[PDB]
Amino acid sequence: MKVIVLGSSHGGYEAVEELLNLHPDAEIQWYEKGDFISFLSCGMQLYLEGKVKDVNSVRYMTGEKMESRGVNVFSNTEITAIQPKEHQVTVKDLVSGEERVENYDKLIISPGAVPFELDIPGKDLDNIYLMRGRQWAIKLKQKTVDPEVNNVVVIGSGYIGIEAAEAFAKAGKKVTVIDILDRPLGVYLDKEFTDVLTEEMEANNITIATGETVERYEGDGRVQKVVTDKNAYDADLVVVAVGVRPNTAWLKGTLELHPNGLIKTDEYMRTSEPDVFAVGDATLIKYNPADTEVNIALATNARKQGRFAVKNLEEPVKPFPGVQGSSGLAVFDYKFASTGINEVMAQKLGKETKAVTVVEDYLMDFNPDKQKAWFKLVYDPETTQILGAQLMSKADLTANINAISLAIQAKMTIEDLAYADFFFQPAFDKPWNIINTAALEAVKQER
Ligand SMILES: Cc1cc2nc3c(=O)[nH]c(=O)nc-3n(C[C@H](O)[C@H](O)[C@H](O)COP(=O)(O)OP(=O)(O)OC[C@H]3O[C@@H](n4cnc5c(N)ncnc54)[C@H](O)[C@@H]3O)c2cc1C
């Protein structure tokens, strides 16, 4: 049987991995529009910030290694169209320009996304960058050592915009983060966490310009000024980290798209077309916190979906278990993680929640290594079942969030987490740990 896999990023790659496990006898074709197989964009900041020196080491598979395993790898080859009834696709070698058609029995696509760009005047000036993949990683890195970047404005205050801000701020530059949102990281954290992160960012000389609409880019030849509705900001570099467009317009009319380009798929990753499967940033995923489907553009998601697309190749047997949308990141000295519903996700779903925050030393009083840790536990007002949590400390407590991910999944309640057995040892935590204490507080709040 022959199986074509589009994309060598997370969903693409994991579909050929599981093809090699469940279907090791199938003719597999792995296509990649670009020159490099499997770059880890999620490694960009360690490279940018200097901890990883070789940008080609920031990857997790090579074409060659897959070819060692029987996989037909065509990089620099772009699938230009899918003909689903005809069971064929059209590909175009981008280095020679040759067009060709390939037949498939099953096709699995993970075309992913592309940075959203602001269609504002000046949008064509030099030095207005994006942050995704290897060429942007290299170009961005050279700017961190350029003697002429003095001020850089990153537009967008989410995971990526803050990673960029931190990288160029540590690089020695003057960074300003501009965004219409009024809190940095609001998609990930609630106000009681992002105020601490705004002060930590500001101490590292970043200006957080929230509540501002970027109007226009000004400059002569190369960008010189980013001007917003309430201010004009100097800029020798702009990094645009505002959103991701689905890379699906080429599928308009071939497969069924959601009003925002996202490919419609079911629990077994099937598209509206027979024998075409779609996975990764360009799809929705089962969000178990509120029993719904939501787009959560994360590595972890595309990888589990890439594997499930393969499991359901012949027949719909393993429905996707769903995810909670867990994330973790360190912003200068603070390491935070969160999973499930927070203020913004609850607003976006129109889901009413109740919650508590406990900010205290996560180690007992007598232990000299004690530090504040912040934990917020969000639950359902009627069932008190766990809907999400956020934690943050200069001590890395991030692994605690995986527990919360499984409690939400398992529909546990604040009473369950209140007396859940979590180990205590005084060099490691307090007798009722971080999770038990917030839940004990929620219980008390619901007495
Ligand atoms: C800066 C950055 C940091 C991130 N950090 C994290 C993190 O730390 N943790 C985490 O969970 N996630 C992180 N993510 C999100 C994560 O990287 C994405 O969710 C992940 O890339 C999965 O995307 P995907 O496999 O659907 O495809 P994408 O990553 O969008 O890539 C799709 C691939 O398919 C190729 N392709 C597309 N169309 C064609 C075509 N027609 N023919 C042939 N090839 C084609 C593209 O060139 C590309 O190589 C981050 C993303 C970025 C940009």
Side-chain angles (χ1 to χ4, degrees), residues 37-245:
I37 292 280
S38 301
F39 183 75
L40 190 76
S41 294
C42 336
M44 248 183 279
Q45 191 185 215
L46 288 164
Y47 164 71
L48 289 196
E49 294 191 353
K51 152 150 284 168
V52 171
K53 304 304 178 172
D54 182 1
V55 82
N56 303 312
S57 71
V58 185
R59 65 141 109 207
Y60 53 92
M61 181 41 72
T62 59
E64 295 86 1
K65 180 83 281 175
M66 278 291 178
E67 296 185 297
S68 306
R69 292 164 73 180
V71 177
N72 288 309
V73 183
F74 311 90
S75 54
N76 288 317
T77 308
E78 170 183 14
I79 288 180
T80 57
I82 299 169
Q83 291 97 246
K85 320 311 296 101
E86 286 69 68
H87 267 247
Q88 285 158 26
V89 286
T90 309
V91 312
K92 175 184 202 156
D93 179 324
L94 292 193
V95 19
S96 57
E98 164 260 43
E99 295 233 40
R100 153 187 129 223
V101 342
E102 284 276 4
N103 309 79
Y104 67 71
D105 279 358
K106 312 296 203 168
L107 168 67
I108 301 183
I109 59 173
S110 178
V114 292
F116 180 87
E117 302 203 69
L118 308 180
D119 188 45
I120 57 178
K123 64 152 279 90
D124 21 53
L125 289 158
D126 289 325
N127 301 144
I128 306 174
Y129 287 10
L130 281 349
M131 182 156 173
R132 182 165 275 232
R134 201 166 81 92
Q135 305 302 303
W136 275 130
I138 297 178
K139 291 195 179 177
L140 240 11
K141 220 305 183 211
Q142 302 304 297
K143 290 283 160 182
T144 70
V145 296
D146 190 334
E148 294 204 276
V149 170
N150 297 272
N151 321 272
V152 12
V153 176
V154 353
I155 307 186
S157 64
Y159 208 83
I160 298 179
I162 297 300
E163 286 195 346
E166 185 182 315
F168 284 91
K170 297 179 174 175
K173 273 92 167 63
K174 286 175 281 169
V175 181
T176 291
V177 176
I178 294 171
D179 197 353
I180 359 92
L181 299 207
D182 52 35
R183 285 183 295 123
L185 295 169
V187 175
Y188 303 90
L189 271 20
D190 285 5
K191 192 168 183 295
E192 47 270 273
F193 294 83
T194 51
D195 292 343
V196 176
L197 294 193
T198 299
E199 284 166 64
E200 180 71 18
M201 275 184 289
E202 286 179 328
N204 287 98
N205 198 36
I206 304 174
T207 283
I208 299 299
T210 49
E212 282 180 64
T213 304
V214 177
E215 229 71 81
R216 164 241 311 191
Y217 301 105
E218 291 174 36
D220 183 20
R222 33 146 282 184
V223 67
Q224 291 166 345
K225 226 97 71 199
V226 173
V227 50
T228 81
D229 64 335
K230 308 179 178 170
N231 224 304
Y233 289 109
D234 279 279
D236 300 314
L237 225 205
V238 174
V239 168
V240 193
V242 124
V244 104
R245 302 172 178 114

